[PDB]
Amino acid sequence: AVWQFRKMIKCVIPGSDPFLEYNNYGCYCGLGGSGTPVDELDKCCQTHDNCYDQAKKLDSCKFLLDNPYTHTYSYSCSGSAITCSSKNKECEAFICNCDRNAAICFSKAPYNKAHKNLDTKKYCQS
Ligand SMILES: [Cl-]
Ligand SMILES: [Cl-]
Secondary structure, three states: OHHHHHHHHHHHOOOOOHHHHHOOEOOOEOOOOOOOOOOHHHHHHHHHHHHHHHHOOOOOOOOOOOOOOOOOOOEEEEOOEEEEOOOOOHHHHHHHHHHHHHHHHHHHOOOOHHHEOOOHHHHOOO
C-alpha cells in the first residue's frame, strides 16, 4: 500500500518528507504521467508507474491489484535497508518489489529542486 511505500522512502532516505518531496516532481513523479522523463529521479518514477500499470494487467493479478495503492504486503526496514518478506503471496510480492526498487532508485538519484512542481501541460507533451 502507498503508506508502506512512503515508509520505505524514510528508511533509505533519513529525514525525508516522502509525500511533499516525491509527489509532483518532473513528468512522472506522482499519479500518472506523460512525455519523457527529465532526469534520473523522474526516470525512477516512470519505472515505478509502469510497474503498477503492468500489475493491473497481469493474468493472475488484474483483479487483486485493481488498486495497488491500498493492497497490503509484508516488508521490513533495518539499518537503512529494505526487505520484501518471503511470506508474500504472488500479487503482494509483485507490488512490494515495484515499491522497494523505486525507493532504492530514489536514494541513488540526485534531487533537482528546479524539477519540483514542473508545468506538465507545457513541458511533458513532446
Ligand atoms: Cl508516493
Ligand atoms: Cl539527474
